[PDB]
Amino acid sequence: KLFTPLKVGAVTAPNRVFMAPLTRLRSIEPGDIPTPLMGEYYRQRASAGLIISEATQISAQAKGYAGAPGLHSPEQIAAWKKITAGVHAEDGRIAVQLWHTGRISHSSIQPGGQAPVSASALNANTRTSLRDENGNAIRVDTTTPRALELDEIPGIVNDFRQAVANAREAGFDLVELHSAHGFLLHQFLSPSSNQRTDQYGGSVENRARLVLEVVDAVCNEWSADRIGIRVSPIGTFQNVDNGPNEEADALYLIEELAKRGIAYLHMSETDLAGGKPYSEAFRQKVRERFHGVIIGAGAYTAEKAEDLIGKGLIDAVAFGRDYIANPDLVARLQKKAELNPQRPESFYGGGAEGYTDYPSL
Ligand SMILES: Cc1cc2nc3c(=O)[nH]c(=O)nc-3n(C[C@H](O)[C@H](O)[C@H](O)COP(=O)(O)O)c2cc1C
Incomplete structure (x- = not known):
């Protein structure tokens, strides 16, 4: 089933082998500008059923990693x-x-060199990636954030809206909202990172309020059939857990998302460091609540993908690291060819080496 077509919102994928979003930290600074080398990397992978780009800033304030691209400036849009x-x-x-x-950010790459923002003022207690004086990636402890004031929240929603408008002009087929992995939307979703006492904290309805305002805004800006969302709602990701009622809270969010009729739901199932596997019962509960495409990700094999697609529980699989190392992953999985070995030391930063130099068959 992996090599059969799938309607995904406004487009049709010819196969179910998707390229997961992968931060590679190779953009130009100043300007957080995509490069011709990045263009080549994505072009090499264009046989994917769908490419999901590296995470991309909606605004300058959104930046947390040196080398991650934006989609807010004219030069970024052109690139x-x-x-x-x-x-x-x-x-x-x-x-x-x-x-x-x-809050997964550092003051040195924020506008004005000031503190980054979050739901609440507590430190992520992790690291982000900056660049040194020679342009090489380095890991640096995150800066303590300040809590967004209530009157700043509409601006965040507007920044997502504007970035989607810009994505449409830039020629993307779809947008994927990053509501996973301990970044801003997940910081609001999670009780561990959200101690607010206004209408954006406390109950699950309040914790999901921001992401659902964003979904509504971007559906209105473009079209619901152009919008996907990535969630990581079971487990702990970059120190952001999903709280004591994670299953029920996940199903609440998914039911709300379904009301908007969006193109897809992309579930990042496990952190890179591991986590409890999704039960088939939970997969069935998700499937009956969402009426678009469901993409599974997190250490998948072709075997696992075929099993779950055949069981009618997901529609497609996003591969991350196998796509880093195999531009023609589709052809390799179709022919049962060996994969190129991964070189994790060059996942982040640098240049062509470990980026565009993994050969196709
Ligand atoms: C180098 C690297 C960068 C990643 N960057 C992102 C990212 O930009 N956005 C995101 O949602 N997930 C990101 N992830 C997670 C992947 O999308 C994926 O969930 C993870 O690679 C597990 O899938 P795999 O076993 O197929 O690699 C990244 C993973 C790696 C290895």
């Missing part, structure tokens, strides 16, 4: 237009993953 054109030239499809990093 992304070239990238999507290259993918389209090879008959591919590409979604842009849009984030605000919130």
Whole structure:
């Protein structure tokens, strides 16, 4: 089933082998600008059923990693237009993953060198990636954030809205809202990171309020059939857990998302460091609550993907690290060919080495 077509909102994927969003931290600074090298990397992978881009800033404030691209400035829009054109030239499809990093950030890459923002004022207690004086990636402890004031929340929603407008102009086929992995939207969703006492904290309805305002805004800006969302609602991701009622809270959020008739739900099932597997019962509960495409991700194999697609529980699989190392992953999985070995040391930062130099068959 992996090599059969699938309608995904406004487009049709020719296969179910998707490229997961993968931060590679190779953009130009100053300007957080996509490059021709990034264009080549995505063009090499255009046989994917769908490419989901690396996480991309909705605004300058959204930045948390040196080398991550934006989709807020004219120069960024112009550069992304070239990238999507290259993918389209090879008959591919590409979604842009849009984030605000919130508290997973550092003051040195924030506007004015000031503290980053979040739901509440507590430190992420993790690291982000900056660049040193020679442009090489380095890991640095996160800066303590300040809590967004209530009157700043509409501006966040507007920044997502505007970034989706920009994505449409840049020629993306779809957008993926980054509501996972401990970034801003997840910081609001999670009780561990959200201690607010206004209408954006406390109950699950309040904790989900921001992400649902964002979904509504971007559906209105473009169209619901252009919108996907990535969630990581079971387990702990970058120190952000999903709280004591994670299953019930996940199902609440998914039911709300379904009301908007969006294109897809992308579930990041496990952190890279591992987590409890999804039960089939939970998968069935998700499936009956959402009426668009469901994408599974997190250490999948082709075998696991075929099993779950055949069981009618998911529609597609996003592969991350296998896509880093195998531009023609689709052809390799179809032919049962060996994969190129991964070189994790060059996942983040640097240049062509470990990026565009993994060969196709
Ligand atoms: C180098 C690296 C960068 C990643 N960057 C992102 C990101 O930008 N956005 C996101 O939602 N997930 C990101 N992830 C998670 C992947 O999308 C994926 O969930 C993870 O790779 C598990 O899938 P895999 O076992 O197929 O690699 C990243 C993972 C890796 C390895």
